[PDB]
Amino acid sequence: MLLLTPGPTPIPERVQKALLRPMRGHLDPEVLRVNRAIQERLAALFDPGEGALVAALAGSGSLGMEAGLANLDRGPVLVLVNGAFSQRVAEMAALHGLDPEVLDFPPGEPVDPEAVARALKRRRYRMVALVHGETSTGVLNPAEAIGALAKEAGALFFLDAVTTLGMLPFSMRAMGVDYAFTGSQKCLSAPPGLAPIAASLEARKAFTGKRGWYLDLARVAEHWERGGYHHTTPVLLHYALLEALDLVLEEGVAARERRAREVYAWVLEELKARGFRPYPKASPLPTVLVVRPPEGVDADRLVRALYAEGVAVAGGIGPTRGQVLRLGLMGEGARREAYQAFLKALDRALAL
Amino acid sequence: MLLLTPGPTPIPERVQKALLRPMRGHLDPEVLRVNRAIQERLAALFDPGEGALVAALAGSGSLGMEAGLANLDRGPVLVLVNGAFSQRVAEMAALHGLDPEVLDFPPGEPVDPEAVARALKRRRYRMVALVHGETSTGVLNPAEAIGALAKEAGALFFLDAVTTLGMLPFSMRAMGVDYAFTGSQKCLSAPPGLAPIAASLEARKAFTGKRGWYLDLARVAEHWERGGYHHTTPVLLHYALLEALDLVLEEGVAARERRAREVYAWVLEELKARGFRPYPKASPLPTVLVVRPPEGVDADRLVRALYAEGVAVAGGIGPTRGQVLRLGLMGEGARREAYQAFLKALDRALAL
Ligand SMILES: *Cc1c(COP(=O)(O)O)cnc(C)c1O
Numbered sequence: 001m002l003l004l005t006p007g008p009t010p011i012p013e014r015v016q017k018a019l020l021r022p023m024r025g026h027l028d029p030e031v032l033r034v035n036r037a038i039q040e041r042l043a044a045l046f047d048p049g050e051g052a053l054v055a056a057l058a059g060s061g062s063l064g065m066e067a068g069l070a071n072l073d074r075g076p077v078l079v080l081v082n083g084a085f086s087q088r089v090a091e092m093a094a095l096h097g098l099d100p101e102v103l104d105f106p107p108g109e110p111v112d113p114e115a116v117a118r119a120l121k122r123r124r125y126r127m128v129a130l131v132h133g134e135t136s137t138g139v140l141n142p143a144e145a146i147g148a149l150a151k152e153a154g155a156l157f158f159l160d161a162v163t164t165l166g167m168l169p170f171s172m173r174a175m176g177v178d179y180a181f182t183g184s185q186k187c188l189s190a191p192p193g194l195a196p197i198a199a200s201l202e203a204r205k206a207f208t209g210k211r212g213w214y215l216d217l218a219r220v221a222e223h224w225e226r227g228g229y230h231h232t233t234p235v236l237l238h239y240a241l242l243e244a245l246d247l248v249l250e251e252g253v254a255a256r257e258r259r260a261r262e263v264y265a266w267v268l269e270e271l272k273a274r275g276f277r278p279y280p281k282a283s284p285l286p287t288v289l290v291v292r293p294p295e296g297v298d299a300d301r302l303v304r305a306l307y308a309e310g311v312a313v314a315g316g317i318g319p320t321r322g323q324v325l326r327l328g329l330m331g332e333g334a335r336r337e338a339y340q341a342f343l344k345a346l347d348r349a350l351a352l
Numbered sequence: 353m354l355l356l357t358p359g360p361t362p363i364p365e366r367v368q369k370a371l372l373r374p375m376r377g378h379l380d381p382e383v384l385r386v387n388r389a390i391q392e393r394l395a396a397l398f399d400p401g402e403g404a405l406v407a408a409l410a411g412s413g414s415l416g417m418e419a420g421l422a423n424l425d426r427g428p429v430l431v432l433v434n435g436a437f438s439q440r441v442a443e444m445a446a447l448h449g450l451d452p453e454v455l456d457f458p459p460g461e462p463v464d465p466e467a468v469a470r471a472l473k474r475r476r477y478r479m480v481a482l483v484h485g486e487t488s489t490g491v492l493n494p495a496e497a498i499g500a501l502a503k504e505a506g507a508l509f510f511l512d513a514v515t516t517l518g519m520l521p522f523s524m525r526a527m528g529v530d531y532a533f534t535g536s537q538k539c540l541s542a543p544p545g546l547a548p549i550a551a552s553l554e555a556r557k558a559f560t561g562k563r564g565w566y567l568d569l570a571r572v573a574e575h576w577e578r579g580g581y582h583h584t585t586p587v588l589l590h591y592a593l594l595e596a597l598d599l600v601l602e603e604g605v606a607a608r609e610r611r612a613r614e615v616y617a618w619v620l621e622e623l624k625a626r627g628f629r630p631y632p633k634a635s636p637l638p639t640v641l642v643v644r645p646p647e648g649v650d651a652d653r654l655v656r657a658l659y660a661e662g663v664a665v666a667g668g669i670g671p672t673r674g675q676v677l678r679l680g681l682m683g684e685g686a687r688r689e690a691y692q693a694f695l696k697a698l699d700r701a702l703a704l
């Protein structure tokens with residue numbers, strides 16, 4: 001089964017093999033050494049600024065997402081929404097009593113900075129939340145521009161970097177980001193189960209809220225910065241993530257973005273040639289190709305047919321439910337050989 | 353590095369190799385079926401009763417612990433404290449505003465069911481929480497008897513089964529347990545990263561509290577029971593946990609309990625021969641041998657010396673921090689050969 005979902009992603013042999021290394025206690029000096037290395041690799045990708053907390057939470061990307069909200073002292077929080085995942089940020093913010101104010105944008109369209117600027121003049125916010133790449137719509141939001149607006153407004157800047165960190169240019173310092181996160185199984189192409197996160201010194205100063213034990217970033221810091229015991233970590237996944245992070249830096253984000261954009265263009269033309277139409281109206285996310293099926297072809301039925309042909313892709317989600325196919329172009333998903341197989345399988349499905 | 357820490361534990365090759373199987377999407381019908389197989393085997397060990405929620409949370413055992421508390425509609429909660437991990441329960445219960453009431457007992461001594469009964473006659477409790485095997489002190493608490501008292505008082509019974517599930521006779525049904533949990537790396541000898549849980553029908557009815565997104569057992573239910581989307585799961589760990597569960601049931605808990613007991617006895621004799629003294633004053637935990645070193649021998653230094661000798665064991669934690677050696681007899685730790693190597697290493701350590 002060829003894995004072309006927009007997360008999880010195919011895992012490099014070198015990475016999956018690291019899972020075979022001898023198991024060790026989570027406080028074993030070697031594991032601690034591995035952990036400091038992970039922080040170094042993550043710091044290079046995140047570019048969090050001095051005094052930041054860098055770690056890999058023991059859970060999925062969603063855990064990373066929730067940690068940056070549940071640890072916040074107070075709201076309100078301006079949540080910029082234009083997809084299923086930014087909608088999840090809003091749901092979490094509401095749950096933790098952070099008094100979120102949702103600013104909606106049409107699914108398939110990027111968040112407009114000018115609209116955000118107007119909203120930031122309406123009320124004072126403790127934090128502004130945005131999803132860099134909305135996986136549910138295949139839209140890339142203008143994170144840098146919004147970060148600048150957030151800094152001017154004196155608000156912390158929360159940014160979901162799942163579809164961008166490890167594949168497209170990214171810098172917390174440059175974009176004025178205070179909290180960034182991702183999952184191990186996205187652009188990093190590592191086994192799922194970990195959530196790399198980064199909190200700027202300013203975020204840490206504000207992260208005094210106590211609403212959860214497992215996601216308490218102060219407890220996480222004790223382990224990642226001082227080698228103390230928080231809870232047992234998924235050691236084998238740590239080995240794998242470090243291996244995956246090295247693969248990323250070895251290739252370079254610049255080259256990885258080119259590999260994604262290159263495949264994105266080719267596949268889109270092949271699909272348009274078969275009657276497919278892109279979903280994003282503007283600012284398409286290069287790491288996730290979202291397309292509407294040819295006339296008369298049901299999206300979900302096509303997803304099932306593809307599976308029968310040996311290929312796994314995602315159907316719509318949230319605002320795009322049952323209306324599209326979402327193809328992964330992050331990590332090992334962005335490969336010529338992989339999509340040539342996809343197209344062959346796709347044609348077999350369309351033939352029926 | 354021989355792993356004799358009371359969690360994590362040695363992973364048999366058959367189990368670790370399962371991590372090399374083809375990666376698949378978390379919603380792949382094949383993975384969904386592996387999850388069903390996991391629930392079936394967990395149910396065999398837990399014996400949760402019909403209508404129960406059985407799952408493996410994407411996180412360490414502590415996540416399983418918090419899930420059983422954060423979802424509770426209301427308190428008060430009678431928390432029976434006997435060591436580090438029951439203290440963690442108290443911590444989390446206070447964090448989520450469950451109006452916890454702590455009933456203490458000396459570390460090294462088991463919880464007194466007579467004192468529990470008296471406490472229950474004093475006030476109505478929504479839930480009674482206990483740790484089956486207190487890993488920090490190496491003491492086994494009378495869970496079955498405590499469960500009967502909870503059922504009498506009409507309180508839900510929360511039980512940490514980390515050091516017992518998968519190694520010692522266990523049944524929620526027979527022990528009147530409403531919420532039981534463990535971690536994948538304990539007695540099951542699987543890679544850390546998952547937290548098997550089981551919530552009885554009555555627990556689910558009371559689990560309407562909404563304090564966390566990631567640990568929302570309702571959201572977890574949609575995925576484990578109905579195959580819907582909650583968040584990406586650590587699919588590879590799922591493969592490994594299933595293999596681990598199969599291995600556990602092939603051997604049977606009776607044979608595993610026997611293995612642990614035999615080695616516990618002989619090891620303690622060997623240790624006393626060297627001047628060590630057992631920490632527990634009564635009701636020892638067959639799966640965790642906790643001992644104080646000979647006078648004049650620093651426990652933490654001894655742990656570091658053992659490590660240098662190629663053997664990993666745990667030092668104290670919570671009340672026993674720096675006062676003991678905690679030897680694992682959970683899963684693959686309960687092996688004659690493993691401890692014969694432990695002693696040879698211990699002697700090299702003691703000669704320094
Ligand atoms: C190990 C342990 C836990 C917690 O597990 P982590 O996997 O480290 O989160 C909880 N309770 C007991 C009794 C344990 O031994």
Ligand SMILES: *Cc1c(COP(=O)(O)O)cnc(C)c1O
Nearest residue numbers: 060061062085135162183583584
């Ligand atoms: C995948 C993803 C997440 C995290 O989801 P998990 O499935 O919990 O790992 C968050 N945001 C976006 C935009 C994502 O694509």
